[PDB]
Design brief:
Two copies of one chain form a homodimer. By secondary structure, the first copy, chain A, is an alpha+beta fold. In chain A, 31% of the residues lie in helices and 12% in strands. Chain A is built from ten helices and 16 strands. In chain A, α1 packs antiparallel against α2 and α6 crosses α8. At the A-B interface, β1, α6 and α8 of A face β1, α6 and α8 of B. Chain A: It is found in: Cell membrane, Sarcolemma; Cell projection, Dendritic spine. Chain A: It comes from Rattus norvegicus (Rat). Chain A: This is Nitric oxide synthase 1.
């Protein structure tokens, strides 16, 4: 089989063979497409085959397929699984898997960087405090004074699912949200539920607008614990506008390190419930989503009022106009403070390049158009005119239930 | 089974039961999503007809009745005899209105029922088609107060007597390749602009030249016609704050009329069914004017605004885009021609969805196409989860006539 993909702006066509290896479901039938849907304890019998294909790929990548190191490893694993039920990965395998989980992330436009990832082996960690130390080093190394570096910390893999390691925060660094009795919201509405759990666990919230949330870390299945990330480790950028001198008076600022922490990393059947991972922001995620989604800091009205725009009738595009300035500002502020960041034009052009290379490299590049195209100026970026095939490959990063909806408290 | 759809901006969850009645395939599989891919007999005809007639009667509260059953037999026998059949007027109107209703890629379906249907089934010639099309263009333009419309020429018979409108739209600008290697006018039509030339049309080699209609009837060779200029409502694009805009010398037409699609109703295929409504601002502002392969005016527009085009991070393309789309919506309103912006259009669609889910059990929607090509996440339709599936009656793509005609 072969599947064709065309770019309606360069007439450039590509052939995908990689999709043949995709096993998992996508949520789509031959009769229904759920492409725009958000979210459409493994037995011994299930584990080995998964371990096998993984180790087969690993070895193939290092050009040692069928070798002696290859077979002995398969025999070693098969045996270990039979007696211990599970199995531990070698460092080189963990490193290989992590990079590939990233490489297979169909919703990630910054994948050109997949190969350059710093993997921290946190499998010897045993307590929440231990996790705090590990996280702190991840944040420090990754931030690098503004010159960001990719990185991921991998904590202990799941055993019986009763002893999971989990990072309760969705991102290692994030602002608190507090619902006021008057119905309004202070801070980031997206984090209100979590902000609550934190206060209910002992966090003394400053009750401000940009309060860096505390980490709630869960080790070996025990109750989660609170910790405050060293302020001197949390790099932040105050947002001002290049020409709008009233912008600085909006009181806005954002953190520099985006590090998702609620996903699950699957490598060769093994599940890693806690695997925080960071890279570096694309302007629009802060500029259009965090600042402008109606359900976030929703700053359009106030940025428009001060821009003195005709907010009488939407056909004036006061919202579109304000959005560009706001994004102008997020990018300008980061550049001025020498903190890594990429704009949607650069990131998307690079992605097309990475994408093409990946077709002539491994016969495909699973991509989710809905998530790849930016939340603004979509059609003036190259990814918009790009056809994409979306399929699941392992290793992978998956969503998982929020830890508070399942955890059995002691 | 039973699928639910959530809006992540309002948390509203709707339940879809309509997809169960899905016929054609989507191109996807459990193994691969093709969401972003632009395009993935007597025994055959009667079942298709029955399904349609069934829906029709169910819609008029006469499901099963004698009328229902009678007509069902009438058609059955007709197909048995004439190897095909003809739709009563009421079924045609319903069929067309419902093909629109089922257009998963159209954001303006909230207007689905308010569609004027012109029955051009008795047409026999290209001149006849011009007369029909002309009346269609004048009725829908209505001096700027646009009205939705569709004209349906004779349905297919043996496939060698196909009625077709070679233009992709009843009204579009010509595109010409210049000595240089560049392109004058609209690149999207360069080819067709050539076929019109190879056929006789005297191309004025201008930036915005209104192409001629190339009409085909009963499988014959296509003929050329010039839509009465008095019937082609155009708008010069000026900016509400940049008096230098006019100097860009831009103008677009007011009537969006897709004409290269094929309408299927109850098994029957109407290969010539031009339909029109009114423009959503972004279609012209961002796609027609800014798309790299179209007019690609961004570089010049930026200049004139005197902004740093040295680094992409200045968002000068973004900057220009907004102003260019301001100018489009601005001009249309000032000349009192109907037009809708991406903000109102999408808000309207959401409501339409809320109605369709309770009044029909769902609404087939293609996210990739519904989300406007600018300010996507600030329009409500961005956070709206969608379910795409194909339903008939429907509008489908079909091969360009020049790539399949026997002259
Ligand atoms: C180098 C900087 C990087 C950039 C600029 C980049 C950019 C992005 C963006 C814009 C998204 C969509 C964000 C959203 O709307 O929520 C995304 C998604 C994602 N990225 Fe990256 N990324 C980078 C690094 C990483 C790293 C290091 C990994 C993993 C090791 C990764 C894995 C993913 C995953 C799994 C998602 C989807 C998350 C979800 O399903 O919600 N990205 N990335
Ligand atoms: C009344 C105003 C209407 C508005 C504002 C509207 C708007 C839209 C938009 C924005 C698209 C995507 C355009 C593109 O990117 O090419 C579209 C596509 C479409 N619309 Fe509408 N529409 C309207 C009326 C109609 C009518 C009257 C019909 C049919 C009776 C219709 C049938 C369709 C179809 C089939 C498509 C998809 C065609 C394709 O795949 O290229 N629309 N519409
Ligand atoms: C409903 C729809 O799936 C949802 O709004 C998606 C669309 N595309 C997205 N794309 C990115 N990058 N991030 C998001 O959160 C979303 N949300
Ligand atoms: C490749 C991709 O399918 C293609 O660029 C689509 C995306 N969404 C679109 N949406 C609309 N409304 N119109 C288009 O022409 C497209 N092009
Ligand atoms: O840049 N982003 O917009 C963005 C969003 C979500 C996750 C990440 C990571 Br990990 N790096 N950058 C990201
Ligand atoms: O508004 N649009 O962008 C648009 C595009 C393509 C076709 C139509 C029709 Br018919 N009405 N509006 C349309
Ligand atoms: Zn799909």
């Amino acid at each position: 089989r072969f599947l064709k993909v065309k770019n309606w702006e360069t007439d450039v066509v590509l052939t995908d063979t990689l999709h043949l290896k995709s096993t998992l479901e996508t949520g789509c039938t031959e009769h229904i497409c759920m492409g725009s849907i958000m979210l459409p304890v493994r037995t011994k019998d299930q584990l080995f085959p998964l371990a096998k294909e993984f180790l087969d790929q690993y070895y193939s990548s290092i050009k040692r397929f069928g070798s002696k190191a290859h077979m002995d490893r398969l025999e070693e694993v098969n045996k270990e699984i039979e007696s211990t039920s599970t199995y531990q990965l070698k460092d080189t395998e963990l490193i290989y898997g992590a990079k590939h989980a990233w490489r297979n992330a169909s919703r990630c436009v910054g994948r050109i960087q997949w190969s350059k990832l710093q993997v921290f082996d946190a499998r010897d960690c045993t307590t929440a405090h231990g996790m705090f130390n590990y996280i702190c080093n991840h944040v420090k190394y990754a931030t690098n004074k503004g010159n960001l570096r990719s990185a991921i910390t991998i904590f202990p893999q799941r055993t019986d699912g009763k002893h999971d390691f989990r990072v309760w925060n969705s991102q290692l660094i994030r602002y608190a949200g507090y619902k006021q009795p008057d119905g309004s919201t202070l801070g980031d509405p997206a984090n209100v539920q979590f902000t609550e759990i934190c206060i209910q666990q002992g966090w003394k919230a400053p009750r401000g607008r940009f309060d860096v949330l505390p980490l709630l870390l869960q080790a070996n299945g025990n109750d989660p614990e609170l910790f405050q990330i060293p302020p001197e480790l949390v790099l932040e950028v105050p947002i001002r506008h290049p020409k709008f001198d009233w912008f600085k008076d909006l009181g806005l600022k954002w953190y520099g390190l985006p590090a998702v922490s609620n996903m699950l990393l699957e490598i060769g059947g093994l599940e890693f419930s806690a695997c925080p991972f960071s890279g570096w922001y694309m302007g629009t995620e802060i500029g259009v989503r965090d600042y402008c989604d109606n359900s976030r800091y929703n700053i359009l009205e106030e940025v428009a009022k001060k821009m003195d725009l005709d907010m009488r009738k939407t056909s004036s595009l006061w919202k579109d106009q304000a959005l560009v300035e706001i994004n102008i500002a997020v990018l300008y502020s980061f550049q001025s403070d020498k903190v890594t960041i990429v704009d949607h034009h650069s990131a998307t052009e690079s992605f097309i390049k990475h994408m093409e290379n990946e077709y002539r490299c491994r016969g495909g590049c699973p991509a989710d158009w809905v998530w790849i195209v930016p939340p603004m100026s979509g059609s003036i970026t190259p990814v918009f005119h790009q056809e994409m095939l979306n399929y699941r490959l392992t290793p992978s990063f998956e969503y998982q239930p929020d830890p508070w909806n399942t955890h059995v408290w002691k």
